[PDB]
Homo-oligomer: 344 residues x 4
């Protein structure tokens, strides 16, 4: 069987990975085993003190996050979306399947990495967004997966079919609202319930957010032109969900743009192109690995508009990780991953 | 094979029954098939216009709620929690498994029914709360199920073990907070988002809420003493969840009360007795069919305190319906029903 | 002395006008008196049944919305943001100060009106956004006020200074999140608490939202260039608030753009330019008549970014109405209107 | 003029005190001056970095919380609801007006204090709940005010008129829901937005919550009998508000109970007894100093039911502090304190 460890098990991404593994058919039939669950602090505590929703695992004792603890597993999830896991990954075998939820292996330009993260570039691993052109090929049987950021997932699914078909200009604007679990479980005044409830705020604006070059990198991969990205994230009083509104100038008719999205996504199990007249809502995808997408043309403004809704913790993080895990191990890509949201 | 219809498919309960059926192992292996989906209005619309989270069924055309449309189905969910379905159930073929989410077949006292509902009592069907003493045996192979109300589910699970052991006085007090989906999908000013967000309110207080006699009935089934129930429901700004705080005067040691909960729930997969020092939270059970329960004694006030958390749409409605359906059809009781919540 | 009537008193805008009037210094000293409160339904009910927060007026009996009831008032608020009040305004005595919260008198182009609203253009009244160039002078002593829409208020405050200085291109993009009270108090499934809580959705996208031409009109007033507007509104799980993210292509230094904002807003008491390194939040302006604004430049994307936060019911509706009323009556513009939000 | 200092200015209670002082008529006419604003950490920061809603004070520099800094003021608010301010208060003159939002001077029984707080009893000051029998007398011209806890305020306003008239039994049950600002601004995993949003949980149950003896003390003051209190607090996804549901057995008719509440509250400016048929909602009192109260009798359960809604930060904390300040200084009790909530 495949023995899986989860480093960063007490955080939100780690808890969501474990929820999905508990429901995975390979866990049910014994082909997947949940092994070491580790954290940087609170080793010796039980998982129930961190994730009371995961009652089948409530008695598991959290262990320290160390290469020795993570060795001896066939697959290791590094469930630190805001952490830097290059040092730990360098201690693990190339034949161990490593799935990093953090950013350390996402970027392919060392100069861009140094500017936005202020450290030496660790390299790049196959990007865990199987729906991007060419990405599924790179993931099949890989032993290394860099899971995408949550905002780039929504923006790239909204924009890449139009840009790959050369139907929009390569200067794009993205304004995305997100629930607060995407900021992680570290306690901060600005993430307190009293602060977030009843309020919305943009943050890290005008190109300083580290997901900006990640969006640019994904879009540059489908075009020959210089790509520019205006990316604004907005925190809203929800625990989960990302609704990305993405725009770009266009000279193309809506019929041609719609056909490009139908062609890109008609056989993609997790991407749902809304019927004409319907628009995405994050409530409809919560708990699911689905992305709901709609496209339109603002004739007066000569502007293409694409809306994408995902669950930031599933298709934006842990669901992408499990989906890519399935591809890496040769299991059905959809195993353990529902398209049905938990609404209302 | 069992072909299932859902009447009132466009409401919250009907949408949640459909979510559970889509994830049910008998659906995946072909033994359970989803047939007619009906509503009293909007016949001719598609299901995706009502329940965008249910994308596998998005193209289904909603049909009128009529006996003729519901014929040819082995099981019919009357997913009208606030409706009166005695007239429609009388029109179906009597061999159908009829599962009523509403109240018409819950109560066993005709004078109590007439006082609270203003009509002639129709009778009673096996009560779909399998964990109550004697209930599971009435559900095995039944062709009739009366799904419990959502508040009585939480209150009865919280209180019945202590009362059955005669360890608390039979005058109980229940104050239960509920998310707003329990009030149904009918549009009213008082249920609008702007009104509910940022606000809490008790309603139908001092014994006028129709779940008061339902709680009393379930408790009277476990004791010979005269039972009284003070029940206050409180709407809070959440979409789902019920947290019931239940009290009664006691002079019994806490250890004896805990022993009663252990005897009732040690072999019940959907009831989780919290570890010492932990308390339930509705966010830990959302999406699951579980009830998380904790008990304590206030020695200064000589008061027993029981806290129960459920998802009002799962263990309080649709999950109870599906759990009881499994018993009716001879399928594993837990099929299609998870104990793991979708948190945060 | 000014006796004021409020037509549509039972809606959200009417309730907020009444809250501001009750706190207005002219109400406390006797110069402003609150007269008839009317609605199209529920005549004969009391105001407390509709607006329990307005306890000083709880005993007032709601009257029918009819010209005869509205006679004898020096000022009449037509507090119907989603209504068409041209017919009723024609029935009032022409010397009345008429303050329309709806759209009928906002637009200045008859062909644009007919395209977006499907009817004959009625004309235009002085636009109740005193901070726009030229607007305050049209409001002094007016007997007619067209209150701006809530989204245009935020977008115009965010963008007009940069465009007036010719420092950004005239093709602007606006993505604005809004709490649900902006959609009005009419009960619809899509506005129910269970639906809105935990969810975000864009709506009326790609130029079909009727505030698109209103934003374009306000911007065309400050430039000779051809203006285009891509406007996307997004409903989020809050009762109040609008956060507008506004963008346009620029090659101008940030210091010059900041100078334009300083020139426009240095003497405007309701406009707060954030200190360097701070960004607006809708929770900081709730209950106040203030707009908090920040600007920045994304040099990599050659994009200007302006963020504006307002309370949609105060500076976006009722506070704009009262601010303009003060100008109409010759009272201090700030009377009754606070710059301090109710946070958290 | 009266020079006022606020110790704990960067917390929620301190910010709310300052919001009320900014709107106080004595601040407008110069009779009240806002002096030193202090905090235990972050001295040297500006108030705008902690309370962006308080823009008139945004440039004030936070000073260290020291007796020397607080000396030289005529009145000092100790805005530490969860802190222990006896050591600081002992350094200030008996003629300085000290208003303590914390608990150190609330209790009149040293043995009860030691059991619940684990420290030596500091003494007792006049209790800042002017509506309690005899309390207004004690506050007039005092130089010392112990502001009540937020939950006791709601419970005592709900229960004292019935108990003082000997119309209910002295064993009471209180289940109160509260928004998260009552837990204070200290960053904690369990107070994170992602945790609190979409969830409810009881905490500190079965008599361990320190407000239990505070409720008992207030009730014992109006009766000759042994009082017992079962108090359960429940955290809900709101930033503000307390809805207390309070029950007790009774032999009295509703007409007699209603008359007792009409007599107690008919001349109380901040206490609104709901008209028959209406029930309190916390949304209707947010931002106001009002309490909305309803009473009823559950005939079948022989139980009196009282519901009270307050804003936990205003009538539950800072509004009580300002109301008591007015009484201490001989100013109109209602100065600076609205009864009109900010709804929706």
């Amino acid at each position: 069987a495949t023995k899986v460890a989860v480093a960063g098990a007490s955080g939100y991404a780690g808890g969501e990975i474990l929820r999905l593994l508990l429901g995975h058919p390979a866990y049910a039939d014994g082909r997947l085993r949940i092994g070491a669950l580790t954290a940087a602090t609170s080793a010796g505590s039980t998982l129930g003190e961190h994730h009371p929703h995961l009652t089948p695992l409530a008695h598991r004792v959290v262990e320290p996050t160390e290469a020795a603890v993570l060795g001896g597993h066939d697959a290791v999830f590094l469930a630190l979306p805001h952490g830097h896991s290059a040092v730990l990954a360098q201690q693990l075998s190339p034949e161990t399947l490593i799935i990093d939820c953090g950013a350390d292996f996402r970027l392919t330009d060392a100069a861009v990495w140094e500017r936005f993260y202020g450290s030496s570039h660790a390299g790049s691993w196959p990007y865990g967004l199987p729906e991007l052109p060419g990405a599924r090929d790179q993931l099949r049987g890989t032993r290394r997966i860099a899971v995408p950021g949550c905002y780039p997932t929504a923006a790239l699914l909204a924009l890449f079919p139009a840009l790959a078909a050369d139907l929009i200009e390569p200067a794009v604007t993205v304004v995305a609202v997100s629930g607060t679990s995407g900021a992680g479980r570290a306690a901060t005044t600005d993430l307190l319930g009293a602060e977030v409830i009843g309020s919305a705020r943009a943050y890290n604006i005008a190109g300083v957010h580290r997901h900006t070059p990640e969006i640019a990198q994904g879009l540059r991969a489908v075009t020959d032109r210089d790509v520019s990205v205006s990316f604004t994230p907005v925190l809203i009083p929800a625990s989960r969900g990302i609704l990305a509104t993405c725009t770009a100038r266009t000279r193309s008719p809506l019929s041609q743009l719609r056909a490009a999205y139908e062609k890109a996504y008609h056989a993609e199990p997790f991407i749902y192109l809304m019927p004409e007249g319907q628009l995405p809502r994050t409530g409809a995808v919560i708990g699911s690995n689905a992305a709901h997408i709609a496209v339109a043309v603002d004739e007066d403004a000569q502007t293409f508009v694409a809306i994408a809704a995902i669950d930031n913790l599933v298709k934006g993080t842990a669901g992408a990780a499990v989906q890519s895990m399935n591809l890496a191990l040769g299991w059905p890509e959809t195993d353990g991953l529902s398209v049905v949201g938990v609404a209302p």
